Amino acid sequence: FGDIQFGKYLRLSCDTDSETLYELLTQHWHLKTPNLVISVTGGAK
């Protein structure tokens, strides 16, 4: 748990589900979406 300064981050396991992640991110944190854009890279050193 915790915030970041130099920003809410979280260390999370791969075995967790998806629904209570959505409940955490919508109820505690900000609201929903009409759209959701995904860009995949990551090997771009």
Side-chain angles (χ1 to χ4, degrees), residues 20-40:
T20 192
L21 193 153
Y22 183 77
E23 293 179 355
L24 180 68
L25 204 152
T26 52
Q27 292 180 356
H28 295 281
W29 295 356
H30 62 277
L31 56 91
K32 293 180 181 179
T33 46
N35 194 3
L36 192 146
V37 180
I38 300 161
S39 178
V40 291

Side-chain angles (χ1 to χ4, degrees), residues 8-25:
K8 293 184 283 187
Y9 68 95
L10 176 59
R11 181 179 177 180
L12 187 63
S13 179
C14 295
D15 293 331
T16 189
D17 53 350
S18 297
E19 58 90 20
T20 192
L21 193 153
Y22 183 77
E23 293 179 355
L24 180 68
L25 204 152

